Write a structure and sequence with these properties.
Ca(2+) 2 binds at residues 56, 58, 60, 62, 67. This protein has 148 residues and is mostly helical. The chain has helices spanning 6-18, 29-39, 45-55, 65-76, 82-90, 102-112, 118-125, 138-143, and strands at residues 27-28, 62-63, 100-101, 135-136.
Length: 148
């Protein structure tokens, strides 16, 4: 669960820094809207308040960088997902740098849970361009998951 893409997250942290009271990096619901505006968006104190009213139970009342991503992803509705997927595979890439196990891979399909039931993912994993024992070019699986 790395939320948006590392890049968008990089520029986000920057904003999260421009606004940092605890000196650590977190911010207060009050500066929230101010941070969202700095990122490059233009939310409304209304919806912005709708999210705060929720995270207003952390105990301290302040929001941390991660929690801020969550509320930030709800407005942007994540990306093309191609990111959460690519990483889903790296979670196993043991130096292979280009291939992952087919078994574990099947597990990745369980985490995402798109629209390819085991039967669909099976017919695929069955011939995902394999050749060795059970390796799979996750890279090809990342795009081949969308195809036409």
């Amino acid at each position: 669960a790395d939320q948006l893409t590392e890049e968008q997250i990089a520029e986000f942290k920057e904003a999260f820094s421009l606004f940092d009271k605890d000196g650590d990096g977190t911010i207060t619901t009050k500066e929230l809207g101010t941070v969202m505006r700095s990122l490059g968006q233009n939310p409304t104190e209304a919806e912005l308040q709708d999210m705060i009213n929720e995270v207003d139970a952390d105990g301290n009342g302040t929001i941390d960088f991660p929690e801020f991503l969550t509320m930030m992803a709800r407005k942007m509705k994540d990306t093309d997902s191609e990111e959460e997927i690519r990483e889903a595979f790296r979670v196993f890439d043991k130096d292979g740098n280009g291939y992952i196990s087919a078994a574990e891979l099947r597990h990745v399909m369980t985490n995402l849970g798109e629209k390819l039931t085991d039967e669909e993912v099976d017919e695929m994993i069955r011939e995902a361009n394999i050749d060795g024992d059970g390796q799979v070019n996750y890279e090809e699986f990342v795009q081949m998951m969308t195809a036409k």
